[PDB]
Amino acid sequence: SRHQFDLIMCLKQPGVQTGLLCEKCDGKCPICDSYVRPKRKVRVCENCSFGKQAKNCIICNLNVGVNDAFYCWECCRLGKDKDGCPRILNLGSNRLDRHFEKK
Amino acid sequence: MPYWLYKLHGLDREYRCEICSNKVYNGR
Amino acid sequence: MAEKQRQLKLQKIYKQKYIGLGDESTTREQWQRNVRNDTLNTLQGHSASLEYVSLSRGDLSIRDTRIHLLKSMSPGYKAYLREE
Amino acid sequence: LNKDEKKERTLSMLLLKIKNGNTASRRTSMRILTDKAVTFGPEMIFNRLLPILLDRSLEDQERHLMIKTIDRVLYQLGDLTKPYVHKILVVAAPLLIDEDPMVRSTGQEIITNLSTVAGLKTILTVMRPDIENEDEYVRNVTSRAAAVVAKALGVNQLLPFINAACHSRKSWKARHTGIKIVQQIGILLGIGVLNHLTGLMSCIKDCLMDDHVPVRIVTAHTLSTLAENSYPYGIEVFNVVLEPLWKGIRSHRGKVLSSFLKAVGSMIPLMDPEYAGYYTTEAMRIIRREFDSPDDEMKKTILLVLQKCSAVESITPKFLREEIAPEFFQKFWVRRVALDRPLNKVVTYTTVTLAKKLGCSYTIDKLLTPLRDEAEPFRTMAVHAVTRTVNLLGTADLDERLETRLIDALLIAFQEQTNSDSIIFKGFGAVTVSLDIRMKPFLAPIVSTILNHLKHKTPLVRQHAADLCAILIPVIKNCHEFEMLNKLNIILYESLGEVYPEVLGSIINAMYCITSVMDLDKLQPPINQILPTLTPILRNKHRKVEVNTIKFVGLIGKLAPTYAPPKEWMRICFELLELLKSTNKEIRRSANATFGFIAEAIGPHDVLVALLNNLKVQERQLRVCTAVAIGIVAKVCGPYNVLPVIMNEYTTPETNVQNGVLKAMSFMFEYIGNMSKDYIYFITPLLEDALTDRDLVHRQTASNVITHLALNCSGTGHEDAFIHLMNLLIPNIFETSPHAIMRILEGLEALSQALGPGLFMNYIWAGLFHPAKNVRKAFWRVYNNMYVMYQDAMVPFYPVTPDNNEEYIEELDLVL
Amino acid sequence: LSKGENVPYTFQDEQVRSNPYIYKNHSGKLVCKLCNTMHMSWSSVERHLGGKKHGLNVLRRGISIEKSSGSVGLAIQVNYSSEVKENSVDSDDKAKVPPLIRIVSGLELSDTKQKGKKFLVIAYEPFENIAIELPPNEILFSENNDMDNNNDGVDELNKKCTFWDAISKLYYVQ
RNA sequence: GAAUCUCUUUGAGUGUAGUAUCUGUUCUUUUCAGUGUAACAACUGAAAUGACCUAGGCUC
Ligand SMILES: [Zn+2]
Ligand SMILES: [Zn+2]
Ligand SMILES: [Zn+2]
Ligand SMILES: [Zn+2]
Ligand SMILES: [Zn+2]
């Protein structure tokens, strides 16, 4: 993602199916994390859909997704829209260190 | 006396120029 | 640390998708080849710049100029013209 | 010695600090390891580090800290000897089986990194003696480990290994686990099995025929995982294995017949319509014969085959209602089912998938008797089924009678509930939303129950009472009773002073749903009296109370600005500006969203002074959120009001006020998309001083302004200010730190579209090669980003002449 | 920590400072204009002044400064205080030094407006300087009055023609 | 709720990545070869002593 470096996106050929965001990540561009002015729907590759993993949010990939995810207008102007499948794979160091910090 | 100073700044390094009397210059 | 290590990875990916991307040290030949491919693709792609090249070279058919441009992207195409 | 024994001391002190140490201590020692990892011997790093992870005294907290160090070292050193490979697999391998998926993933990143580090040849040499092990646990582990390696390096490179283990006549356990590897490979790759499935199939088929049963079962599960993960495509391959499944089903019975019916059942939906009808009808007989099986496994498989076969077009819904359905509901809805969850999920989901073929009124018809049963946890499951079924099929099928009995049972089972669950709310709500106009004659008692439940002494029943109102308010409008809206709203506004926050938030949410729906003037309390009773609630702390209160106040800000006097609005602003210290996000986002509503309500200049007074605070959350607030105010009330005040505020000598000014300007630029053009011209002398200033934060943050400004101001025709801005930026290319450099690069990329590709390139081509290995390393990055944004857009702009490069292009010099 | 002293901003265009170096730039942070150092807190500043590099810069500034930078006559009778204020200062600090006179050209003045004549300036430590215009190119400029005795004091002018009645505090000059 | 009396006032959170900036301590001589650097630098291994003359040596 933008703010967290250890995350690794997918970047494959986007399929025909739209990604989904959890209520918590709702209304955010998967690239720059901008809450404002959405533009288009995201699209994810086959290997990012398949089973239950398709229902998860495409940013945090933990909670279940509900709303379709949108690219903000700027990321569509820059063209970072069409790079590929913008699905985060690994969970990152922050979330894990939170989980084990609490218990 | 400022030992490290000339090595930083590049001075006290022997150098030569052919066109003026093959003159020597101590810094770049 | 980890950020740069992502930079290398996205470098490897974009260099795969978009073909030529200079990294740090790229030979003049390696880069000039990319320039050649881009230029030829522009000449063939737009029907405008294809009309212009076709009429200027006076070839008998558009497709001859287009295939000439495609063939020109391979290095051995020069020598191939010389053996005719 | 004594010099290098000091190193032996440094690694011990570090590792100690990471495992047991202060936060700021371990945080720096991690950096020291990552930067110094190359100069310490990996023999010493792993030789010292690994013995810690073996003891039993380590907590999960202290274990993950060591794991992270292992990962950071492995990803760096890049080359490792085989003994340490085996050791790291001994430590990391057990993680894939751990109870929670977090440890699974972090133990998976290890093996997927080591697979690249240690290479293909070494790990396979490590696994070969391990698969033959007599132990069950080790084999279970390195099945999963082997699959992780398989996905990591690609499956084809590791495939003949699997073929060797599977087809090995030497050892039996080698065949067993060699087959399990196909399981977890099928799981990890997901749909991506596909093309590899043929090669994988070389293993399974013959490995299915072993005389030993526990291998015959494992192959049967592999066929199920491959069959489901594939989906319709994989049929053409499984035809070879399709025959022996039938000679296995008709005989072996016991626990094996369960596995083979799982396999064939998972093979059904990918079969052609011709065969599907046959194989289904063959399976249904065995299904009916096996209804009475006490084994959990066999019931689980039966629910799978019924689960899949409903999708088959061959069987008619009449065939299901006449025969299979009544035998289903009576057997699998026994109250003993409702006690164990994993089988509950399968029974409910099976009923839901049968609801498609079956009539909605028929499925719901059979589901009313479990609703009216006395058992509570059984009524809950009976609710789940109705919820999901109604969600799929809608209520259009229901006759008035079932429509009455359903809602009756939902009221009853609603009022005795114990555990906190939304399944009633959604479900009892999913009913309402669907049939809402048809709901009217039932609405009077329902509300009464709520009005009783609000007075109940238990906090949960009060939560659940208030929550169900918020769902009914839209359908209550559709049922047109406004007097009930007012009576509710009054009773809630009276109950609004409750002690328990968790209930109070829900109460305020119901208030919200009432206020948004109903006519503003007809509200009884009314709003003008409502809000001054809300302002003390914002200090209730907790969260949900704050969230719901803020969203409600914002609803008033949209709908009813003119009621509360502007001084009271200023009290609101002073409470929110204090309130956004909250740790939660949505609290802050909602607060910032409300400043637009208030600034629209009363005025910009009374809010702006209050906000700018808050940028002098040290904490970062406060400054950033006030920056976003200034951005939203500038959007809603217009930039020409906020811009001169902010530009005046930037004159203050304090650092944090200046950075806050630049950031608020970033937000107010990305919020107004097009406008942005009239306003530049003023702010370039403001960016003039920002891009010049010494510290690296101003140069960072100001470039972020240049991104949002240049992207959506491009093509407007200014372009003489963006050349200025660029001329100020270019020298910053050499700057280090991650944050400034990414913002600067984004800035140059935005300026590329304001200036154009060529006018932007004229700066870069110079040092694009260059002697210095650094200037080169810096410019090739900007040329990379420009090349990604523009390929055929830079073609006229290359610096190439016939004598500049060997070949050039002879056709660019032609003229007609 | 700051000892309550106001450290002015760099741009405020100069109340005497304690150390005439540490400022606050246009931004918030603290600066040492010699060493060109940015300090976050006043403690770090006190460590800079107590540091070795600042001393080196102070000395280098010291060297940098130390390398660059039968006729008619008139008689004046200047009177001084009557033990009114000189009762608080008696620490043999140049107290033995008598008033001094010098001839100054008006070519240099704080205002630099008009000029072209000389002044017979007379100075004493506490009291304020005094001047007397001398239009005549030369008056009483004698020729070897005494018999060439060499105690230059300050100059030929002072020894040649001045008297300091220190007991009564009366300075005569002619 | 109402009635009376006295006195007073007014008129220290938290975690994940990452920068920036000060202080303290060392500067081994000298040559050659390798690494490295845009050039330096830095890193790696080997060894200058005796004599003479008016800064220098076709010096031994
Ligand atoms: Zn993907
Ligand atoms: Zn999410
Ligand atoms: Zn975006
Ligand atoms: Zn010269
Ligand atoms: Zn200083």
PDB file of N, CA, C and O in Angstrom, chain C residues 21-40:
ATOM      1  N   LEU C  21      12.844  -0.837 -19.666  1.00  0.00           N
ATOM      2  CA  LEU C  21      12.985   0.160 -18.614  1.00  0.00           C
ATOM      3  C   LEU C  21      14.436   0.136 -18.174  1.00  0.00           C
ATOM      4  O   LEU C  21      14.924  -0.901 -17.713  1.00  0.00           O
ATOM      5  N   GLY C  22      15.121   1.254 -18.317  1.00  0.00           N
ATOM      6  CA  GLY C  22      16.463   1.338 -17.798  1.00  0.00           C
ATOM      7  C   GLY C  22      16.488   1.220 -16.289  1.00  0.00           C
ATOM      8  O   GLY C  22      15.643   1.761 -15.582  1.00  0.00           O
ATOM      9  N   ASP C  23      17.481   0.495 -15.783  1.00  0.00           N
ATOM     10  CA  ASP C  23      17.558   0.288 -14.346  1.00  0.00           C
ATOM     11  C   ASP C  23      18.583   1.224 -13.719  1.00  0.00           C
ATOM     12  O   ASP C  23      18.216   2.220 -13.088  1.00  0.00           O
ATOM     13  N   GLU C  24      19.865   0.913 -13.872  1.00  0.00           N
ATOM     14  CA  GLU C  24      20.922   1.851 -13.535  1.00  0.00           C
ATOM     15  C   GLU C  24      21.924   1.853 -14.678  1.00  0.00           C
ATOM     16  O   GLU C  24      22.070   2.850 -15.391  1.00  0.00           O
ATOM     17  N   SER C  25      22.610   0.728 -14.863  1.00  0.00           N
ATOM     18  CA  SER C  25      23.564   0.553 -15.954  1.00  0.00           C
ATOM     19  C   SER C  25      22.855  -0.182 -17.084  1.00  0.00           C
ATOM     20  O   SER C  25      22.546  -1.369 -16.984  1.00  0.00           O
ATOM     21  N   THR C  26      22.608   0.536 -18.174  1.00  0.00           N
ATOM     22  CA  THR C  26      22.074  -0.047 -19.396  1.00  0.00           C
ATOM     23  C   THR C  26      22.972   0.386 -20.540  1.00  0.00           C
ATOM     24  O   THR C  26      23.223   1.582 -20.714  1.00  0.00           O
ATOM     25  N   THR C  27      23.460  -0.583 -21.308  1.00  0.00           N
ATOM     26  CA  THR C  27      24.354  -0.274 -22.410  1.00  0.00           C
ATOM     27  C   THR C  27      23.647   0.613 -23.425  1.00  0.00           C
ATOM     28  O   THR C  27      22.421   0.577 -23.554  1.00  0.00           O
ATOM     29  N   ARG C  28      24.430   1.427 -24.134  1.00  0.00           N
ATOM     30  CA  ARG C  28      23.855   2.275 -25.169  1.00  0.00           C
ATOM     31  C   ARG C  28      23.090   1.447 -26.189  1.00  0.00           C
ATOM     32  O   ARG C  28      22.051   1.880 -26.693  1.00  0.00           O
ATOM     33  N   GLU C  29      23.569   0.239 -26.485  1.00  0.00           N
ATOM     34  CA  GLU C  29      22.869  -0.623 -27.430  1.00  0.00           C
ATOM     35  C   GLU C  29      21.526  -1.066 -26.870  1.00  0.00           C
ATOM     36  O   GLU C  29      20.507  -1.053 -27.572  1.00  0.00           O
ATOM     37  N   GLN C  30      21.510  -1.459 -25.595  1.00  0.00           N
ATOM     38  CA  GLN C  30      20.284  -1.935 -24.965  1.00  0.00           C
ATOM     39  C   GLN C  30      19.204  -0.862 -24.966  1.00  0.00           C
ATOM     40  O   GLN C  30      18.018  -1.165 -25.138  1.00  0.00           O
ATOM     41  N   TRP C  31      19.599   0.397 -24.777  1.00  0.00           N
ATOM     42  CA  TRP C  31      18.629   1.486 -24.751  1.00  0.00           C
ATOM     43  C   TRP C  31      18.226   1.912 -26.159  1.00  0.00           C
ATOM     44  O   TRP C  31      17.041   2.153 -26.430  1.00  0.00           O
ATOM     45  N   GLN C  32      19.198   2.002 -27.070  1.00  0.00           N
ATOM     46  CA  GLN C  32      18.895   2.407 -28.439  1.00  0.00           C
ATOM     47  C   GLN C  32      17.994   1.394 -29.127  1.00  0.00           C
ATOM     48  O   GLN C  32      17.221   1.750 -30.022  1.00  0.00           O
ATOM     49  N   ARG C  33      18.078   0.125 -28.725  1.00  0.00           N
ATOM     50  CA  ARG C  33      17.146  -0.869 -29.246  1.00  0.00           C
ATOM     51  C   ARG C  33      15.717  -0.541 -28.833  1.00  0.00           C
ATOM     52  O   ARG C  33      14.794  -0.582 -29.655  1.00  0.00           O
ATOM     53  N   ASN C  34      15.519  -0.206 -27.556  1.00  0.00           N
ATOM     54  CA  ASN C  34      14.198   0.206 -27.095  1.00  0.00           C
ATOM     55  C   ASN C  34      13.699   1.424 -27.855  1.00  0.00           C
ATOM     56  O   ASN C  34      12.542   1.450 -28.295  1.00  0.00           O
ATOM     57  N   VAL C  35      14.549   2.441 -28.014  1.00  0.00           N
ATOM     58  CA  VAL C  35      14.161   3.610 -28.797  1.00  0.00           C
ATOM     59  C   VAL C  35      13.717   3.196 -30.193  1.00  0.00           C
ATOM     60  O   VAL C  35      12.654   3.619 -30.666  1.00  0.00           O
ATOM     61  N   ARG C  36      14.504   2.353 -30.865  1.00  0.00           N
ATOM     62  CA  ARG C  36      14.146   1.869 -32.193  1.00  0.00           C
ATOM     63  C   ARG C  36      12.774   1.208 -32.211  1.00  0.00           C
ATOM     64  O   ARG C  36      11.936   1.529 -33.065  1.00  0.00           O
ATOM     65  N   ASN C  37      12.521   0.293 -31.275  1.00  0.00           N
ATOM     66  CA  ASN C  37      11.231  -0.384 -31.229  1.00  0.00           C
ATOM     67  C   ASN C  37      10.071   0.578 -31.004  1.00  0.00           C
ATOM     68  O   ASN C  37       9.060   0.482 -31.712  1.00  0.00           O
ATOM     69  N   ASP C  38      10.196   1.505 -30.053  1.00  0.00           N
ATOM     70  CA  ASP C  38       9.144   2.497 -29.853  1.00  0.00           C
ATOM     71  C   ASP C  38       8.869   3.287 -31.127  1.00  0.00           C
ATOM     72  O   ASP C  38       7.713   3.407 -31.552  1.00  0.00           O
ATOM     73  N   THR C  39       9.923   3.838 -31.736  1.00  0.00           N
ATOM     74  CA  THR C  39       9.748   4.652 -32.934  1.00  0.00           C
ATOM     75  C   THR C  39       9.050   3.874 -34.041  1.00  0.00           C
ATOM     76  O   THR C  39       8.074   4.359 -34.630  1.00  0.00           O
ATOM     77  N   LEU C  40       9.531   2.664 -34.339  1.00  0.00           N
ATOM     78  CA  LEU C  40       8.904   1.873 -35.395  1.00  0.00           C
ATOM     79  C   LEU C  40       7.445   1.580 -35.068  1.00  0.00           C
ATOM     80  O   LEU C  40       6.577   1.648 -35.950  1.00  0.00           O
TER      81      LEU C  40
END
